[PDB]
């Protein structure tokens, strides 16, 4: 599925993901836009032999199990199928682990490259929430 | 599957530092963020704090900063310290991973002269 | 901090019947809100998290739901197995906090 830019601000508000752990949810619709251009079916491989899964390109070496990875941790306890879902409820719980760990959203290279620093409300706005 | 459980002095001495410990068992400690949290004698619970993958930390405030959460990857445990304790610090311990999923036995540990 | 206000602070019930458990937020906490159950001389365990997602391996009679400040946790004809206290807790910001808890017993 690929979300609307209002569409998946109502739906990650709805998620939870409007001021938690201190990242308002501009941070949030700007990094999909930017890690999955809102796809939730988006996959990247990487050289490491990982793959980035979902909306929010959560990677398998770390996060998720795809069984196909190295040195796998699968830190949010899920298989990566799991975030390749229309229903963004496991990519969300397991980007919340993700941004509650020291290094909070600068996990997500698009994000940090193309949202921090800028007016990220401005994803939100214009929206019916 | 996984199992933690707590070991450490269940007396200690006004004024001197607390330390438990947190056995895992059944996967790696660098493969999930580990907590603490506390039972105060009157059903009043408190999350003191959690170490993630990143070695980060976070600490409640109301410790004044008088807690230090370790981890041992070689011996697959994590540690609690707690510096300069009193009788408020009386409680049940128990160690938990982040998630929530997986929790200690819990041990009380009592602060008396 | 996010102060997390539980009601009511006894609940006597007869088992069969139904129950349902409040906490409310001082602030918006999104669907951060999870539930859990302490049994004396036991840890606590994890019934339900993100305010209304399930979990593997709790009886299904237990179900939560809300958001932003107000919150409950419902069980749908009481067992023997149910009583004892029920704590709500937030991650929606550090710290992390615990309501009073709600104790379940027996009328």
């Known amino acids: 599925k690929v979300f609307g830019r209002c569409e998946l601000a109502a739906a990650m508000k709805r998620h939870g993901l409007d001021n938690y752990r201190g990242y308002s949810l501009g941070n949030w619709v700007c990094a999909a836009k930017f890690e999955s251009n809102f796809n939730t079916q988006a996959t990247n491989r990487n050289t490491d032999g990982s793959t980035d899964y979902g909306i929010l390109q959560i990677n398998s070496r770390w996060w998720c199990n795809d069984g196909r990875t190295p040195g796998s941790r699968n830190l949010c306890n899920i298989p990566c199928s799991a975030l390749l879902s229309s229903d963004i409820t496991a990519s969300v719980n397991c980007a919340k682990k993700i941004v509650s760990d020291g290094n909070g959203m600068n996990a997500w290279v698009a994000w940090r490259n193309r949202c921090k620093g800028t007016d990220v409300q401005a994803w939100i706005r214009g929206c019916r929430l | 599957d996984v199992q933690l459980q707590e070991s450490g002095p269940s007396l200690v001495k006004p004024s001197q530092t607390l330390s438990l410990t947190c056995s895992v068992t059944?996967?790696?400690?660098?493969?999930?963020?580990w907590s603490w949290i506390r039972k105060f004698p009157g059903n009043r619970l408190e999350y003191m704090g959690y170490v993630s993958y990143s070695g980060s930390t976070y600490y409640n405030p109301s410790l004044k900063s008088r807690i230090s959460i370790t981890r041992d990857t070689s011996k697959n445990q994590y540690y609690l310290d707690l510096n300069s304790v009193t009788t408020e610090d009386t409680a049940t311990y128990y160690c938990?991973?982040?998630?929530?999923?997986?929790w200690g036995q819990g041990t009380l540990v009592t602060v008396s002269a | 901090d996010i102060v997390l206000t539980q009601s009511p602070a006894t609940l006597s019930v007869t088992p069969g019947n139904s129950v349902s458990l409040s906490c409310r937020a001082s602030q918006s906490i999104g669907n951060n809100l999870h539930w859990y159950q302490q049994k004396s001389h036991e840890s606590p365990r994890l019934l339900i998290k993100y305010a209304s997602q399930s979990i593997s391996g709790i009886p299904s009679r237990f179900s939560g739901s809300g958001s932003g400040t107000d919150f409950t946790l419902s069980i749908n004809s009481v067992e023997t197995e149910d009583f004892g206290m029920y704590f709500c807790?937030?991650?929606?910001?550090?710290?992390?906090?615990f309501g009073g808890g709600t104790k379940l017993e027996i009328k």
């Open positions: 059944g996967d790696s400690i660098t493969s999930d963020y």
């Open positions: 807790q937030q991650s929606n910001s550090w710290p992390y906090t």
């Open positions: 938990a991973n982040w998630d929530g999923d997986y």
